[PDB]
Coordinates of C-alpha atoms in Angstrom, one line a residue:
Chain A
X29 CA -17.9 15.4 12.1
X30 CA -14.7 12.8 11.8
X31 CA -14.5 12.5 15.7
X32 CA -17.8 10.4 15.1
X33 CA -15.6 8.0 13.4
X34 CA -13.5 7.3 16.4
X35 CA -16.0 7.3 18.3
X36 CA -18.1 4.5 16.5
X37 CA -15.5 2.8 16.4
X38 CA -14.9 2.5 20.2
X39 CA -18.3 1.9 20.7
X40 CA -18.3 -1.0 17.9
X41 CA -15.3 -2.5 20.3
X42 CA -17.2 -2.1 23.1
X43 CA -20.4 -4.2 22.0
X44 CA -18.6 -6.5 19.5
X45 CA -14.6 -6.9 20.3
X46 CA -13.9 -9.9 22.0
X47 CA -11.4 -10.8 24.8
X48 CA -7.7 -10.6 23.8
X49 CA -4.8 -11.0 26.0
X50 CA -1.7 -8.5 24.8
X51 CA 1.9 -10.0 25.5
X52 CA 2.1 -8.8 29.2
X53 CA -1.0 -11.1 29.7
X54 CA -3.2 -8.1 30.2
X55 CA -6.9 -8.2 28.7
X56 CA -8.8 -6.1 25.9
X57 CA -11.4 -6.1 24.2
X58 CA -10.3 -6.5 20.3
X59 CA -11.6 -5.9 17.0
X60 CA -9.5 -7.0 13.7
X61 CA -9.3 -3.9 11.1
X62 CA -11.0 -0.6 11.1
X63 CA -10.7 2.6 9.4
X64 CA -11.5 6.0 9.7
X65 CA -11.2 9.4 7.6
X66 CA -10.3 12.8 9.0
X67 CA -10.4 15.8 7.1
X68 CA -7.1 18.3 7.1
X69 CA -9.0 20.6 4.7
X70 CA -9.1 24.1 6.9
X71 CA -9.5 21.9 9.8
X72 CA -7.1 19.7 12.1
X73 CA -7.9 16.4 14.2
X74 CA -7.1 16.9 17.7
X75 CA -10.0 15.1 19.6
X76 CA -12.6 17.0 21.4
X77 CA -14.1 14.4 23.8
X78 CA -11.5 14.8 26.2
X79 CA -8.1 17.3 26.2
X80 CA -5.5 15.7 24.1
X81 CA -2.0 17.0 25.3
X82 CA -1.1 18.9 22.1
X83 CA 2.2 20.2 22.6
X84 CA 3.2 17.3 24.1
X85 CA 2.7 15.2 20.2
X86 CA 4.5 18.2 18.8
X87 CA 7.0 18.0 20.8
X88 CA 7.8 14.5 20.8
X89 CA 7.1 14.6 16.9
X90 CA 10.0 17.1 16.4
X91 CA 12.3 14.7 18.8
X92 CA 11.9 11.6 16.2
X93 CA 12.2 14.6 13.2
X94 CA 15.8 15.5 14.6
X95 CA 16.3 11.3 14.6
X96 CA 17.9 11.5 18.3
X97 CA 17.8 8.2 20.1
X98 CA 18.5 10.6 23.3
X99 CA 15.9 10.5 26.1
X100 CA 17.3 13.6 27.6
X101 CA 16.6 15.4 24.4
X102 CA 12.9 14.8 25.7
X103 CA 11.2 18.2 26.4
X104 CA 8.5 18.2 28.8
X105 CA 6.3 15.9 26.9
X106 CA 8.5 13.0 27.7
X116 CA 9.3 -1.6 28.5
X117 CA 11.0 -4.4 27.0
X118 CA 13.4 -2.9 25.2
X119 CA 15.6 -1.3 27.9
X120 CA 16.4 -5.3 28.9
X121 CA 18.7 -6.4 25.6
X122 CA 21.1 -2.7 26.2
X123 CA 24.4 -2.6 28.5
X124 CA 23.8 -1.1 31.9
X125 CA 25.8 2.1 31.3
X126 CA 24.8 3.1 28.6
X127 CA 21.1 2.6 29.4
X128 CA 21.7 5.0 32.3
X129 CA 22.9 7.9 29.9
X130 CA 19.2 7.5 28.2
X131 CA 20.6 6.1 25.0
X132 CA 17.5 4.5 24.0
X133 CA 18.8 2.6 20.9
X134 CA 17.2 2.8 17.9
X135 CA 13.7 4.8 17.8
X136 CA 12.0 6.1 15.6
X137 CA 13.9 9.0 15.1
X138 CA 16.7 6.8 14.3
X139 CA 14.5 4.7 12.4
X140 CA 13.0 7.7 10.2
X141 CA 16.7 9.9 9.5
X142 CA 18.9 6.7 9.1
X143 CA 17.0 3.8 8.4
X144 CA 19.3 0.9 8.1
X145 CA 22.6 2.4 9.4
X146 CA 24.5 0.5 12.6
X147 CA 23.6 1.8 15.7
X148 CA 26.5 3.1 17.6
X149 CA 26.1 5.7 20.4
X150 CA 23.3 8.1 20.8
X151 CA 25.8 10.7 20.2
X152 CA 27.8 9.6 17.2
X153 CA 27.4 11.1 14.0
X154 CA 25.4 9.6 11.3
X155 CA 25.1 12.2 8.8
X156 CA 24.9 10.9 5.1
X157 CA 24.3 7.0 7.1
X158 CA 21.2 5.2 6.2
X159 CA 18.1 5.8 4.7
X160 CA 16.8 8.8 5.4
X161 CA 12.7 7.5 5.1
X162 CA 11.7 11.0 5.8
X163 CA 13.9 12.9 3.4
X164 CA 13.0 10.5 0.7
X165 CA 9.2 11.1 1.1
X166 CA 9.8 14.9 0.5
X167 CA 11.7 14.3 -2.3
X168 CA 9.6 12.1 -3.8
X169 CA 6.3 14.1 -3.5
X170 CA 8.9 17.3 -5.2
X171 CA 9.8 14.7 -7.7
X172 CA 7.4 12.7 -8.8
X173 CA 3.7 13.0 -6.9
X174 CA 2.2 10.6 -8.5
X175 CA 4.4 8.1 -7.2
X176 CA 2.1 5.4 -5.3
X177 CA 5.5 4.9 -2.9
X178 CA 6.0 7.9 -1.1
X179 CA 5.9 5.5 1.8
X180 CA 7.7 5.6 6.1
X181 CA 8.0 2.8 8.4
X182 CA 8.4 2.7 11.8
X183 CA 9.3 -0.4 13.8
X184 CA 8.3 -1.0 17.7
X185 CA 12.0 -0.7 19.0
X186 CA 11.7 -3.5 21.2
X187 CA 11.2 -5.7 17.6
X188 CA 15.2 -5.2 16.9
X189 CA 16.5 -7.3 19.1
X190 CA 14.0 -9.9 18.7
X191 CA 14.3 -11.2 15.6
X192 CA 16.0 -11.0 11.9
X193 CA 13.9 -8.7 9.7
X194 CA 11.0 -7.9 11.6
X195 CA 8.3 -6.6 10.4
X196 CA 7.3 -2.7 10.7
X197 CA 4.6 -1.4 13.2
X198 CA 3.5 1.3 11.2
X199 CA 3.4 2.2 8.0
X200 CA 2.9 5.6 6.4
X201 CA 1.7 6.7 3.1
X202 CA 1.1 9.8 1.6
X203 CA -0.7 10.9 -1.8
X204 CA -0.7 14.1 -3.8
X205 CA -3.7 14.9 -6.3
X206 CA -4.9 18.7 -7.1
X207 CA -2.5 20.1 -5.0
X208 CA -3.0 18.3 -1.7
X209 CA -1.5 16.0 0.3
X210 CA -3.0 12.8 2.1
X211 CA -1.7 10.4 4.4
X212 CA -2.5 7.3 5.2
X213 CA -0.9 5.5 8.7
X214 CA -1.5 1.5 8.8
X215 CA -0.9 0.2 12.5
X216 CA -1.0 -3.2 13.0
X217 CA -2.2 -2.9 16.5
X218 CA -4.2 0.7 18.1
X219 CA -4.5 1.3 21.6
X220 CA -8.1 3.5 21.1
X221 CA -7.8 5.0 24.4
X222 CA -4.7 6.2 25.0
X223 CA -2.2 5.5 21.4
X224 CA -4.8 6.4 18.8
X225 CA -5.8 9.9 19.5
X226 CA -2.0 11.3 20.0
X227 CA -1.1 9.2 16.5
X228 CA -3.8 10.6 14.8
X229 CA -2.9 14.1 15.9
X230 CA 0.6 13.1 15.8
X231 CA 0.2 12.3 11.6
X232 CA -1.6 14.9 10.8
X233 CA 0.7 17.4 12.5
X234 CA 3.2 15.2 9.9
X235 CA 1.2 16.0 7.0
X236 CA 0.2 19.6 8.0
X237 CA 4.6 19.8 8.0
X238 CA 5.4 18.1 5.0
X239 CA 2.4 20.0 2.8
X240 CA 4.0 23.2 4.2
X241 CA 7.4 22.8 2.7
X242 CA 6.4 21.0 -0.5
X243 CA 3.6 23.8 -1.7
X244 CA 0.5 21.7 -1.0
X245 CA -2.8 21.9 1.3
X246 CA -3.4 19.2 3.4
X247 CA -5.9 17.3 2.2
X248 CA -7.2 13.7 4.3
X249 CA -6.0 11.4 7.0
X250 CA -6.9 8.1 7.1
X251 CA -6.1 5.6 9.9
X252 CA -6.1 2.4 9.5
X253 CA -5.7 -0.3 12.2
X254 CA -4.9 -4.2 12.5
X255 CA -5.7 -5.1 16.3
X256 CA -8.0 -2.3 17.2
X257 CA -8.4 -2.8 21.4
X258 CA -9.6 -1.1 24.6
X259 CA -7.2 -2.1 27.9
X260 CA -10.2 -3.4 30.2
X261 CA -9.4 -0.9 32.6
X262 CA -10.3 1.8 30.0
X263 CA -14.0 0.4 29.1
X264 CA -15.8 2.4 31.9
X265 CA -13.8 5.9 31.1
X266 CA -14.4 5.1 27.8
X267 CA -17.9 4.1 28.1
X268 CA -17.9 8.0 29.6
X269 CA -16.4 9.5 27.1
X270 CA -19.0 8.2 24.4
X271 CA -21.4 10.5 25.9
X272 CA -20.1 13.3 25.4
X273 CA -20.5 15.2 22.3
X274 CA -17.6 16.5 19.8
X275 CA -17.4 20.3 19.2
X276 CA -15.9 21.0 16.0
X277 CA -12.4 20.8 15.7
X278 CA -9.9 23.7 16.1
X279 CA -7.2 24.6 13.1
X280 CA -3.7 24.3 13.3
X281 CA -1.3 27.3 12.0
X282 CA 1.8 27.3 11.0
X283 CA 3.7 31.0 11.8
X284 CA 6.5 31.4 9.5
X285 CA 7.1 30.5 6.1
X286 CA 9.4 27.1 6.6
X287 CA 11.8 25.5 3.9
X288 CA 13.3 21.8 5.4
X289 CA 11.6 19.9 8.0
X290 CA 14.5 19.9 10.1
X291 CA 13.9 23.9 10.5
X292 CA 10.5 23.6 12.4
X293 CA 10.4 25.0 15.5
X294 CA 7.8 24.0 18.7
X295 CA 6.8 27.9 18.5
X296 CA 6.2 27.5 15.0
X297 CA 2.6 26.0 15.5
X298 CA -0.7 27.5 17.1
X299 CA -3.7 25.9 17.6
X300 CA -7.1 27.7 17.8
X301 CA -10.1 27.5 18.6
X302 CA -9.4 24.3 20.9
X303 CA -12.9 23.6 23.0
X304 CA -12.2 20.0 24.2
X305 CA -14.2 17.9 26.7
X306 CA -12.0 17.3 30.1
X307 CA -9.1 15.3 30.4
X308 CA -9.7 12.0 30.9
X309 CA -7.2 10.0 32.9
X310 CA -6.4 6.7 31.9
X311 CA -3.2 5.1 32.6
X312 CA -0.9 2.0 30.8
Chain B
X29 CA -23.5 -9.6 0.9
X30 CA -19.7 -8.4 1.2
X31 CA -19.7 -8.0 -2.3
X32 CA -21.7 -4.6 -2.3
X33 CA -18.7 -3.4 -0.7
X34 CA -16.6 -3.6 -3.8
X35 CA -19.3 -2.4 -5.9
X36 CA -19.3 0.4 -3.5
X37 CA -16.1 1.1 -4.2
X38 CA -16.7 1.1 -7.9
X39 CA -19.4 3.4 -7.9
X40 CA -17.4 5.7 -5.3
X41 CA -14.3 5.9 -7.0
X42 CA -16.9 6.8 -11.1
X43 CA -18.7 9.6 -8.8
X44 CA -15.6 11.2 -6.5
X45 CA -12.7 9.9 -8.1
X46 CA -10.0 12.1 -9.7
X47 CA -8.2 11.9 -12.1
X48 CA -4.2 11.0 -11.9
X49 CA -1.8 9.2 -13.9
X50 CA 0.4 6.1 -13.1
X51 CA 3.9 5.8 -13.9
X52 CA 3.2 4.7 -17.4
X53 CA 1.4 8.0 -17.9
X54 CA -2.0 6.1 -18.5
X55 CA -5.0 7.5 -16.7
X56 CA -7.0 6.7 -14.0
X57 CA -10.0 7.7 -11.5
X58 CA -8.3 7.3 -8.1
X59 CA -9.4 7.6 -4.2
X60 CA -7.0 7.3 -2.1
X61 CA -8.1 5.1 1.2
X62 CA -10.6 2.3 1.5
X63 CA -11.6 -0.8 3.5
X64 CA -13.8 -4.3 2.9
X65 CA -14.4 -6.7 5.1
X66 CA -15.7 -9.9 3.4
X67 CA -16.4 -12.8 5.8
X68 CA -14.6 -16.3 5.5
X69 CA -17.2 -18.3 7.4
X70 CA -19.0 -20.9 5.7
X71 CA -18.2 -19.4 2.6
X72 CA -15.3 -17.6 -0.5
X73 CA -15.4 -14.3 -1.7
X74 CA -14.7 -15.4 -5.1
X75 CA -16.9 -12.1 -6.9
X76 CA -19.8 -13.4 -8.1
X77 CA -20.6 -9.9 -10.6
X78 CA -18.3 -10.9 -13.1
X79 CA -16.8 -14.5 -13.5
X80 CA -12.8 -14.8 -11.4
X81 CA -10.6 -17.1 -13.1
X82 CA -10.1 -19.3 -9.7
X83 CA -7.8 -21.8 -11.2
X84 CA -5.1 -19.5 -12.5
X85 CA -5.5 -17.8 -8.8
X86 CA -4.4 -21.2 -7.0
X87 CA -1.8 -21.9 -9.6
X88 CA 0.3 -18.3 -9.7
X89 CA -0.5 -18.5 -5.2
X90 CA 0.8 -22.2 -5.5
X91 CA 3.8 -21.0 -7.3
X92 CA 4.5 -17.8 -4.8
X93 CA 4.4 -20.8 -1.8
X94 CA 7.1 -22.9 -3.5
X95 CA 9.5 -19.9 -4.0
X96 CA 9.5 -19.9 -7.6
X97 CA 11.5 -17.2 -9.8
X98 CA 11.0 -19.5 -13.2
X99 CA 8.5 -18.6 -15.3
X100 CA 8.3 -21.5 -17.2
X101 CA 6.7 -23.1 -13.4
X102 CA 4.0 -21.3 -14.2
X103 CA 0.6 -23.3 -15.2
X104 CA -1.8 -22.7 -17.6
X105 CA -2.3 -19.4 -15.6
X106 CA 1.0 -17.5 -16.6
X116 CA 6.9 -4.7 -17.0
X117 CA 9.9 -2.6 -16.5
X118 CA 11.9 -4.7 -14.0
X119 CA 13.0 -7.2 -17.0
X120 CA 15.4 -4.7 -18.3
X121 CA 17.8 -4.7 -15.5
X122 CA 18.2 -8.3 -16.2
X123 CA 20.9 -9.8 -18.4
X124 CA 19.9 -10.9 -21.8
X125 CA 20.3 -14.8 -21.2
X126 CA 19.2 -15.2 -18.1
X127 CA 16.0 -13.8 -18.9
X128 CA 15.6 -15.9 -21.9
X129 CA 15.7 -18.6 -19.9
X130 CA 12.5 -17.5 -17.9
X131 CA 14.7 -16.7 -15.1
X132 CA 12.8 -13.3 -13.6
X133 CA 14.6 -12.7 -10.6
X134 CA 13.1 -12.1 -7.0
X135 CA 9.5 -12.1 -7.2
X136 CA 6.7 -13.0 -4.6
X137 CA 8.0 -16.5 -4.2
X138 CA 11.4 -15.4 -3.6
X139 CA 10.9 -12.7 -1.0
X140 CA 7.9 -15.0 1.1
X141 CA 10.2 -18.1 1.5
X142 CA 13.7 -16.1 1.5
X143 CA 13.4 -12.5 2.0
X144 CA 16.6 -11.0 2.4
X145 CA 19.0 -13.5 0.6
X146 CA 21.1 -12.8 -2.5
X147 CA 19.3 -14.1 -5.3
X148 CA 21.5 -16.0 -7.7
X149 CA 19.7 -17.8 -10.5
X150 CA 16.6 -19.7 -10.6
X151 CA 17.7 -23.2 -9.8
X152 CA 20.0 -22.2 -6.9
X153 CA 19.3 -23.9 -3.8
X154 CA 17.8 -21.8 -1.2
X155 CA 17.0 -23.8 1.5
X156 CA 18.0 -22.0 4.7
X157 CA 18.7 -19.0 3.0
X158 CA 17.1 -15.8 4.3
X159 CA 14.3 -15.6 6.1
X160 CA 10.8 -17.5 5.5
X161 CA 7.9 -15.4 5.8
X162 CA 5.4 -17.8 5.2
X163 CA 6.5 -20.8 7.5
X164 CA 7.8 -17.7 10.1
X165 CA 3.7 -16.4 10.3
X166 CA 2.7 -20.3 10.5
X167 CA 5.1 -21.1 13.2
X168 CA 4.3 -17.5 15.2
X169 CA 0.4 -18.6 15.0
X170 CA 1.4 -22.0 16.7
X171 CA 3.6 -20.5 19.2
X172 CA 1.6 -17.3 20.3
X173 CA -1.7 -16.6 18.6
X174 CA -2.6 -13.5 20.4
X175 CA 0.6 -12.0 18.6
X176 CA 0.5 -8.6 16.4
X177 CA 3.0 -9.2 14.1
X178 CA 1.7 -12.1 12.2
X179 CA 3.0 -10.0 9.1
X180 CA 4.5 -11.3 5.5
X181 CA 5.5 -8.8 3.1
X182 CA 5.1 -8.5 -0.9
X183 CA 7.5 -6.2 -3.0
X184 CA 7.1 -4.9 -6.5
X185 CA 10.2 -6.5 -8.1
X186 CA 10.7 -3.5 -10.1
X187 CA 11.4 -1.7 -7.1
X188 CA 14.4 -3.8 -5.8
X189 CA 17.0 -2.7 -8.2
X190 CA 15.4 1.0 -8.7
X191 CA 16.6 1.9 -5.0
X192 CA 18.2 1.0 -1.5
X193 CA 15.2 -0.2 1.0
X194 CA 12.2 0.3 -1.1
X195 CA 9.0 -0.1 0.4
X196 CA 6.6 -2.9 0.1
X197 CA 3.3 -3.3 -2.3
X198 CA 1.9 -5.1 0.3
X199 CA 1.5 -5.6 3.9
X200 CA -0.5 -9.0 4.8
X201 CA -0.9 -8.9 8.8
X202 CA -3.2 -12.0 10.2
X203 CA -4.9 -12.4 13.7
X204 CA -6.2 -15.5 15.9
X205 CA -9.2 -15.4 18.3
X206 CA -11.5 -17.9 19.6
X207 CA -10.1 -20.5 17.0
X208 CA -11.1 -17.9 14.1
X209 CA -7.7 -16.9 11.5
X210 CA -8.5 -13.2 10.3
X211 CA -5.7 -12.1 7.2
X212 CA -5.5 -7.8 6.1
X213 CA -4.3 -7.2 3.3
X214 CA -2.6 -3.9 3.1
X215 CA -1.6 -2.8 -0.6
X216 CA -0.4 0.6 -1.5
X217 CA -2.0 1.0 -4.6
X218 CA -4.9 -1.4 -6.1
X219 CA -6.4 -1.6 -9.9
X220 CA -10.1 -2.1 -8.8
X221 CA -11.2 -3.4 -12.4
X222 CA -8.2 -6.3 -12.8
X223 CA -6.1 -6.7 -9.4
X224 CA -8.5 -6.3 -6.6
X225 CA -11.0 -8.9 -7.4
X226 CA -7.9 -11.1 -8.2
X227 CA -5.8 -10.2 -5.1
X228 CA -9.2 -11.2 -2.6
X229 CA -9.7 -14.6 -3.9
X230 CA -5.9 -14.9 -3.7
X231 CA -5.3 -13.7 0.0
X232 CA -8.4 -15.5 1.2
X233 CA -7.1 -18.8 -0.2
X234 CA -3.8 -18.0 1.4
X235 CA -5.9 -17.7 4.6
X236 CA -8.1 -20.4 4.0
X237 CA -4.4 -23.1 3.9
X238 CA -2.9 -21.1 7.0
X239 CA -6.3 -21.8 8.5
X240 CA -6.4 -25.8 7.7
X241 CA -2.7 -26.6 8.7
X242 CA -3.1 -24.7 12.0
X243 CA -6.1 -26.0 13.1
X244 CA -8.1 -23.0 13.2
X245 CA -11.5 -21.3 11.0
X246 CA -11.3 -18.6 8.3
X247 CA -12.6 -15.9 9.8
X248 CA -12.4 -12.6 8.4
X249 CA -10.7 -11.2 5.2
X250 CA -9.8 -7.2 5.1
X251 CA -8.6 -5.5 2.6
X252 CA -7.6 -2.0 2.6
X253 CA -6.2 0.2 -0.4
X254 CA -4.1 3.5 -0.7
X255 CA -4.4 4.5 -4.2
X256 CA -7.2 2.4 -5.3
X257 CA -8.1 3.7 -8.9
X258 CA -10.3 2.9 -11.9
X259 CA -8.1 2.3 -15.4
X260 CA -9.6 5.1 -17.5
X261 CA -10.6 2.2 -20.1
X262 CA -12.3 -0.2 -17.4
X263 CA -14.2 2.8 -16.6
X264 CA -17.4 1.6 -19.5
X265 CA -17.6 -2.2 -18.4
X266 CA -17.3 -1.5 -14.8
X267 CA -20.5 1.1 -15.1
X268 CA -22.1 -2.5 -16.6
X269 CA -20.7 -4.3 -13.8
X270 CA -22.3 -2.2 -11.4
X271 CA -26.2 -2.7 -12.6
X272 CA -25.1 -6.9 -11.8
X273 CA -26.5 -8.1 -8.7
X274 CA -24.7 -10.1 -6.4
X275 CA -25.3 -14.2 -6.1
X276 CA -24.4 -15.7 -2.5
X277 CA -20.4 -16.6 -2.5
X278 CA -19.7 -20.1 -3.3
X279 CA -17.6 -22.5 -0.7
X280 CA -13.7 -23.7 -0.9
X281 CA -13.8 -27.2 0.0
X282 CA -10.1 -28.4 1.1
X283 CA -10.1 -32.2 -0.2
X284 CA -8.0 -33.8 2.4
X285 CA -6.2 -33.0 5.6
X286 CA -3.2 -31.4 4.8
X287 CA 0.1 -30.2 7.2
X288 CA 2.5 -28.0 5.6
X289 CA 2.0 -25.6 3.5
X290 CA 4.6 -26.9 0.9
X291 CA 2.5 -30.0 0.6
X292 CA -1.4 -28.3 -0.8
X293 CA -1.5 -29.2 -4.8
X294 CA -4.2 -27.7 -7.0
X295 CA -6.3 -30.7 -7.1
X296 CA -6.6 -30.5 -3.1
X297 CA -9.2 -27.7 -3.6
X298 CA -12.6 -27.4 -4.5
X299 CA -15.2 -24.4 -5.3
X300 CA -18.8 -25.1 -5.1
X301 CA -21.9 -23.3 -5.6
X302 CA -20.3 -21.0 -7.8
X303 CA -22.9 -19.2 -9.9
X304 CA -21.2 -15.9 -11.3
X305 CA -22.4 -13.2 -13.9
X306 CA -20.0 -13.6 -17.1
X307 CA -16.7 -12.8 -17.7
X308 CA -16.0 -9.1 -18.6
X309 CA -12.8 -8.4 -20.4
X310 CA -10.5 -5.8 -19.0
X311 CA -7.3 -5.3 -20.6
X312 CA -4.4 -3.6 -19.2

């Protein structure tokens, strides 16, 4: 049972990871790579030790999909950064580039949240697609995302995530490298929020899903997570429910939020914790 | 002993590997996702199951640090991307952006091989030194490797290789992302390398090795390494040797081949792999 993974691992933080300070000054306790494997084979890796707000990672996966940069375009599921924009524009909710932006038109100048950039950039997504259609074999078929607060910051920065998918016997894997994983809060909605990627992209391109693997640089627990945490390693996982996709889809950009069904969804409580 | 992991991975990839081909067409036994960790403390994960030519492994990484692009800098330790080259250029030796190139001026317009540089794009290497200096607790202590076959083949490729490092209590910690690893020729070669990288970041900035991660996409077995890897396998492991660093060193540009030492290296004998 994969969950086991995750939960080692936070466990492993708890008794070994030492005391970090992130850039706001506030503590964890850190441990320096990790990695864990999660089977997408007739199963899907929504954790089960507490409720993990599922349509929520759907939702905000088919916001970075469409590439807005529009924080109205939020559905229900809606730092730094917000300093280096112009006032009035900040108040529209143009959040500059994100990872929508970052995904459909990777490269392009940022204008307006509104502008068209059809046909500007690199689209990162696209290109995986293609390449899996064209060549799946290919040991490239790689996505980058970038914290959006990096832009500003400094020339060429470097990514905060990468993403890499695989294709052998007709299924598709994915592997996400983060260079830094909150465990209790960021990790579980990435690792649903990638597979839900993969379960997507297998969909259009012919294939079954096949593994995720999640990799992290700066695995860390915010200090005042280690008690619910501590809580939550008590608690046993109940195998995981199956995602379902309800019609028969042809481009990502087609997906629908009623075009996905979970069942058989028997999570553990919610736990609370809060940035 | 760190080394059983590799081994590990050897015998994992013989027993659940599958089979998929590389761009050549060639075979191999492939698994996509995998970790080490092999510990820098008080000792060098130079692989002691088959002997690791350590000399050439300083002199090609003392050659990436000074930026080269000539092959005729090369030592005693001298694909595709030469046929996008001009004919007399590459006569000349004259190989274009390679690992040099993109660590000490990523980004810049690469004219020919004796062009000065300096100032010219950004420098990865001295950018992760500096950023260790100024704020250790950082997560983007991250310098980025390309296959130069890639840059002309399309806009905004991907890397080959993430390399992310990490500070804590005086300790320097390097992962080593790739997207693909040959586990018969590369890896072994590629962990002495990086750990040596980590072990010069360490000495000019005052801190320990500490750990060394590496972490593979496709890692695969070379359908022909497949026999002297099996012998490989029944080799046991002999305690890691120690780098010695000769004298006190401060920049990075500054570390010569004769500044290093190995000691108490006692490895099995060399097995030829060909690729």
């Amino acid at each position: 049972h994969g969950e086991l993974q995750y939960l080692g691992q936070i466990q492993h933080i708890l008794r070994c990871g030492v005391r970090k300070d992130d850039r706001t000054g506030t503590g964890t306790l850190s441990v320096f790579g990790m990695q864990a494997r999660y089977s997408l084979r007739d199963e899907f890796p929504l954790l089960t030790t507490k409720r993990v707000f599922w349509k929520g990672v759907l939702e905000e996966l088919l916001w970075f999909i469409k590439g807005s940069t529009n924080a109205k375009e939020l559905s229900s599921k809606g730092r730094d950064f917000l300093d280096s924009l112009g006032f009035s524009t900040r108040e529209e909710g143009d959040l500059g580039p994100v990872y929508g932006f970052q995904w459909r038109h990777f490269g392009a100048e940022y204008r307006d949240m509104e502008s068209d950039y059809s046909g500007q950039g690199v689209d990162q997504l696209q290109r995986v697609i293609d390449t899996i259609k064209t060549n799946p074999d290919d040991r490239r078929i790689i996505m980058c995302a970038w914290n959006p607060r990096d832009l500003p910051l400094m020339k060429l920065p470097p990514c905060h995530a990468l993403c890499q998918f695989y294709v052998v016997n007709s299924e598709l894997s994915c592997q996400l490298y983060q260079r830094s994983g909150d465990m209790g809060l960021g990790v579980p909605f990435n690792i649903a929020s990638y597979a839900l990627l993969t379960y997507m992209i297998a969909h259009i391109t012919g294939l079954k899903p096949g593994d995720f693997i999640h990799t992290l640089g700066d695995a860390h627990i915010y200090l005042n997570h280690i008690e619910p945490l501590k809580i939550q390693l008590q608690r046993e996982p109940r195998p995981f429910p199956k995602l379902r996709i309800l019609r028969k889809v042809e481009k990502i950009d087609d997906f629908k939020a009623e075009d996905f069904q979970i069942e058989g969804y028997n999570p553990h409580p919610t736990i609370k914790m809060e940035m």
